[PDB]
Design a protein around this ligand. Structure first.
Ligand SMILES: Cc1ccc(NC(=O)c2ccc(CN3CCN(C)CC3)cc2)cc1Nc1nc(-c2nc(N)cc(N)n2)cs1
Ligand SMILES: Cc1ccc(NC(=O)c2ccc(CN3CCN(C)CC3)cc2)cc1Nc1nc(-c2nc(N)cc(N)n2)cs1
Ligand SMILES: O=c1ccn([C@@H]2O[C@H](COP(=O)(O)OP(=O)(O)O)[C@@H](O)[C@H]2O)c(=O)[nH]1
Ligand SMILES: O=c1ccn([C@@H]2O[C@H](COP(=O)(O)OP(=O)(O)O)[C@@H](O)[C@H]2O)c(=O)[nH]1
Ligand code: NA
Ligand code: NA
Lengths: 230, 230
């Protein structure tokens, strides 16, 4: 019938990729849209482009943040629409789990880059204008959000575990900042956004500080009860 | 009924703004979409943004070309869709004259900036990918193109006439380059583009080297005969 759209949100290395790759397996009605940024740091023209801009961001984030964020968000919309138009056509209760959303792109990452002075006012205002417009022009509007909530310390341990060379320099302070934005947006709900419906949108919060790779039935029970109310 | 969409194309200072402001007056069925870049170098957030990026382009085109071209093209699409959805609702034979198009943005300006090394390969490929996609996601597809063809020398005289301080340093060589791209795209038709229908799309070419401010009936006769065949 009509696909239910659920964003999975959380700090770096909270366990979102682990979680979605568990969910996709448990039902034929369940599919996953991986974060294009994750696929760039694994050959498509999008991957060469993303690979090039990720690398240039390490050298000069104040040069490449605007270019990165716009291309990261474009790539997510096109990947979200491809899944929405290519899968779960003969599914009874189809659910599409997005690894993060257009809202994390803006109110977590792009916002953080503006606050770290990696975008100037003109770049941030062009970005927001582009984002408002790119999204208007109800299709990927979310039925619900699942917040995988983890302490910065757990996420720092899990970056160590994941063992990506590029990521081993991420400091606790950076994760503390991303953590703070997730708390304000999804838990305290103190964040003004420019998308009216988000304030209604149901949020399931899951504490994932404890390892769940081999012990996730309780999280899945809460997901199925969440899905039943939508 | 359904609005006919005609792009006016031509080098800087060929006379496109003069021409469209003549056409808009001759019929209630005739409307004009001015080039947003033209309105930035005349307060909306789009105008502050465009004003800021135009200024920064004079200092450092190799820093701002990507940002400029993407925002210039976004702004044109939104302005084209606003006219298409707000005017000529009770017009019998409605015609909408676009001052330039999404195709001039790409195959004239962005392309020229890439060739002048103001965009690197990653910026040019991101731009083209964005452009392909932004346009797909038949609405602003053109019924025809009117090429106001003028020599670089006429355009250089007309920049002098227009008397914008910012423009008085434009050299003949730059206009010769833009002229060459217009000839290849619209006259010789030697330019491959990534939009299949453009190769069919009818082109009216008008020699506008002679002043027409007070003597434009012949040009308008050719426009009305052109419109009749579409
Ligand atoms: C790959 C990479 C490389 C480098 C940096 N760098 C910085 O974040 C950074 C900022 C500031 C500073 C200090 N500061 C001093 C002052 N100068 C002027 C200016 C720099 C130093 C470093 C970040 C990344 N990763 C990023 N991924 C995203 C992202 N990830 C998604 N999954 C989705 C999405 N939409 N966005 C956003 S950022
Ligand atoms: C306002 C402004 C300011 C500056 C420049 N500058 C250069 O074009 C320029 C390039 C190259 C050079 C030398 N080159 C040496 C080598 N370094 C590395 C790199 C620079 C020097 C200068 C152009 C403009 N105007 C522009 N308007 C458009 C445009 N106009 C529309 N109407 C629609 C649309 N889509 N685009 C495109 S460009
Ligand atoms: O309960 C968990 C969740 C995650 N991980 C590991 O933590 C790292 C980060 O998780 P993931 O890549 O899923 O994080 P994301 O960035 O996708 O949130 C990976 O090496 C996982 O295998 C783990 O050991 N136990
Ligand atoms: O037949 C003409 C056409 C144009 N102009 C002048 O040439 C300049 C450039 O024309 P316009 O601004 O229309 O050029 P565009 O950039 O819009 O092609 C302006 O000062 C016009 O008044 C003119 O004197 N005679
Ligand atoms: Na599945
Ligand atoms: Na009119």
């Amino acid at each position: 019938t009509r696909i239910k759209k659920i964003s999975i949100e959380g700090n770096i290395a909270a366990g979102k990729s682990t979680f979605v790759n568990i969910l996709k397996q448990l039902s034929e009605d369940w599919e996953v849209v991986p974060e294009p940024v994750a696929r760039w740091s694994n050959l498509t023209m999008e991957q060469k482009n993303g690979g090039n801009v990720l690398q240039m961001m390490y050298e000069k984030p104040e040069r490449w943040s605007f270019t990165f964020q716009t291309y990261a968000c474009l790539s997510r919309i096109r990947a979200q629409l491809a899944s929405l138009n290519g899968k779960l056509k003969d599914a009874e209760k189809p659910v599409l789990f997005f690894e993060r959303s257009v809202y994390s792109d803006r109110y977590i990452f792009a916002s953080n880059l503006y606050e770290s002075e990696s975008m100037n006012e003109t770049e941030w205002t062009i970005y927001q204008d582009w984002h408002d417009w790119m999204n208007n022009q109800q299709s990927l509007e979310l039925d619900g959000i699942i917040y995988l909530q983890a302490t910065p310390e757990t996420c720092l341990h899990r970056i160590y575990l994941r063992g990506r060379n590029e990521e081993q320099g991420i400091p606790l302070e950076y994760l503390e900042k991303l953590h703070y934005k997730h708390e304000s947006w999804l838990l305290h709900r103190t964040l003004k956004t420019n998308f009216d419906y988000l304030q209604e949108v149901p949020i399931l919060t899951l504490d994932v500080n404890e390892d769940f790779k081999d012990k996730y039935e309780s999280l899945v029970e809460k997901v199925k009860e969440f899905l039943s109310t939508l």
